[PDB]
Amino acid sequence: VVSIPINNAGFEDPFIEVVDDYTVDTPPGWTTYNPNNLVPEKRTTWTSNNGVGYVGPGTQFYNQLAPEGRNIGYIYLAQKPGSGVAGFEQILDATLEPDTKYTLKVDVGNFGGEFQKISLAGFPGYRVELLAGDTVLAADHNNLYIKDGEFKTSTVTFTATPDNPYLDQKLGIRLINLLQGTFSGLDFDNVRLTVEPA
Amino acid sequence: SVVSIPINNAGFEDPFIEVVDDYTVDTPPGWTTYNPNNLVPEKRTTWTSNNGVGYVGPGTQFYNQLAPEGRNIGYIYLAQKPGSGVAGFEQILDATLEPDTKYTLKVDVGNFGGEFQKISLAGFPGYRVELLAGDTVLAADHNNLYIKDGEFKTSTVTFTATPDNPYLDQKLGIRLINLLQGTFSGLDFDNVRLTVEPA
Ligand SMILES: NC(=[NH2+])NCCC[C@@H]1NC(=O)[C@H]2CCCN2C1=O
Ligand SMILES: NC(=[NH2+])NCCC[C@@H]1NC(=O)[C@H]2CCCN2C1=O
Ligand SMILES: [Ca+2]
Numbered sequence: 524v525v526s527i528p529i530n531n532a533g534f535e536d537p538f539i540e541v542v543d544d545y546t547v548d549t550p551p552g553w554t555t556y557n558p559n560n561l562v563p564e565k566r567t568t569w570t571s572n573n574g575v576g577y578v579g580p581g582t583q584f585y586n587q588l589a590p591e592g593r594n595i596g597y598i599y600l601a602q603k604p605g606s607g608v609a610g611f612e613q614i615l616d617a618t619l620e621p622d623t624k625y626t627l628k629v630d631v632g633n634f635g636g637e638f639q640k641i642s643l644a645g646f647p648g649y650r651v652e653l654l655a656g657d658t659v660l661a662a663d664h665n666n667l668y669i670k671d672g673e674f675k676t677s678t679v680t681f682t683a684t685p686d687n688p689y690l691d692q693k694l695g696i697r698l699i700n701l702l703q704g705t706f707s708g709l710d711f712d713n714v715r716l717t718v719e720p721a
Numbered sequence: 722s723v724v725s726i727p728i729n730n731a732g733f734e735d736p737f738i739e740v741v742d743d744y745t746v747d748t749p750p751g752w753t754t755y756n757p758n759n760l761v762p763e764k765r766t767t768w769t770s771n772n773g774v775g776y777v778g779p780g781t782q783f784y785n786q787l788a789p790e791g792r793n794i795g796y797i798y799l800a801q802k803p804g805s806g807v808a809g810f811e812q813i814l815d816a817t818l819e820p821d822t823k824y825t826l827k828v829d830v831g832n833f834g835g836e837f838q839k840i841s842l843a844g845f846p847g848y849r850v851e852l853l854a855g856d857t858v859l860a861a862d863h864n865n866l867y868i869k870d871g872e873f874k875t876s877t878v879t880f881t882a883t884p885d886n887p888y889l890d891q892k893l894g895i896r897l898i899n900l901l902q903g904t905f906s907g908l909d910f911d912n913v914r915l916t917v918e919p920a
């Protein structure tokens with residue numbers, strides 16, 4: 524049960540001082556997964572965007588602290604449900620190796636409360652993907668029910684056989700806002716990828 | 722408390738098949754062919770991609786067990802190379818999505834093994850089980866179980882519909898997909914069941 528290295532796996536970079544303050548730029552170590560061009564290259568608050576947010580004691584968004592450290596990673600899409608998807612992506616250095624089971628865990632948060640007097644009730648759905656090259660090997664497409672104000676752990680597993688056509692391609696992770704619901708924002712934290720024999 | 726949503730030919734029993742490991746190459750009655758990359762032709766043969774039903778009984782070269790339910794399984798076989806697209810079965814149901822309800826979808830997924838005379842059936846394409854309302858995938862199991870040649874495992878997809886869901890009163894739907902992400906590129910499905918449950 525060795526760990527596979529992921530950059531900024533808990534969105535802890537950058538440091539944020541004030542509770543509930545946030546950035547609006549792609550977190551360092553991740554890129555913006557943008558297959559439908561929903562997220563513009565330059566962002567401000569109230570644009571479709573992603574970034575990190577500080578979920579500290581006293582937070583108005585949850586009934587608990589961050590799953591890990593201070594920060595969560597978030598994705599907010601302004602477009603109406605059905606316009607497409609967006610999220611975060613990271614290609615890893617680890618490659619797909621035969622006779623190995625991979626375990627990917629990430630916590631997913633449905634923030635509640637109010638932003639600028641706008642209700643954050645509701646949820647867009649999520650998908651967590653494990654990749655080799657650009658093939659999605661296994662994914663959790665929105666299986667967990669997650670109430671306003673709480674986080675849950677999504678798990679995705681996959682076993683690579685010596686037959687696998689994608690052996691030796693680089694592993695990837697995607698964390699996606701599905702935009703199938705409003706309020707259309709969600710949080711992610713504490714990305715873990717563990718590898719093991721069979 | 723927990724009700725069944727009726728599904729046509731939910732265990733692929735129609736039509737009846739008499740001989741061991743025999744199969745049809747036509748879309749199973751009650752089901753549609755889900756064909757977003759045109760991988761499956763309208764008229765099918767041995768030499769092409771196809772789907773249909775197959776009998777799994779004593780004698781079977783494909784499984785270390787008998788069919789999960791009744792006599793038959795439903796199968797999808799794709800002849801194109803890995804990465805070419807996906808195909809599968811789809812069924813639009815009578816029922817529509819209701820608020821404050823929890824849906825559970827279960828299906829047995831089969832990895833047939835065996836060797837048909839120099840052609841090995843070892844290996845597996847990958848599968849996806851989808852629950853739909855309208856044209857929207859609410860929840861899906863994308864290839865999360867590991868299934869050895871010759872065995873079946875049960876996939877479960879669950880979804881809770883809240884009052885604010887944009888998709889209420891849309892017709893529920895099911896898709897069973899061959900991902901074409903490995904060879905040998907066939908897999909089987911059985912015993913499809915969908916239940917509803919006050920949240
Ligand atoms: N989601 C968090 N944990 N923190 C809030 C980050 C702020 C983030 N960015 C925005 O521009 C606003 C607009 C409405 C919703 N937002 C957001 O979710
Ligand atoms: N899967 C079953 N139990 N039975 C039917 C399998 C038939 C399926 N379709 C075909 O045309 C044959 C050609 C060779 C491999 N085939 C298949 O895999
Ligand atoms: Ca964190």
Ligand SMILES: [Ca+2]
Pocket residue numbers: 633634635643644645646671672706
């Ligand atoms: Ca919410």
Ligand SMILES: [Ca+2]
Pocket residue numbers: 732733734788789790791792793794911912
């Ligand atoms: Ca059956």
Ligand SMILES: [Ca+2]
Pocket residue numbers: 832833834842843844845870871905
């Ligand atoms: Ca097989």
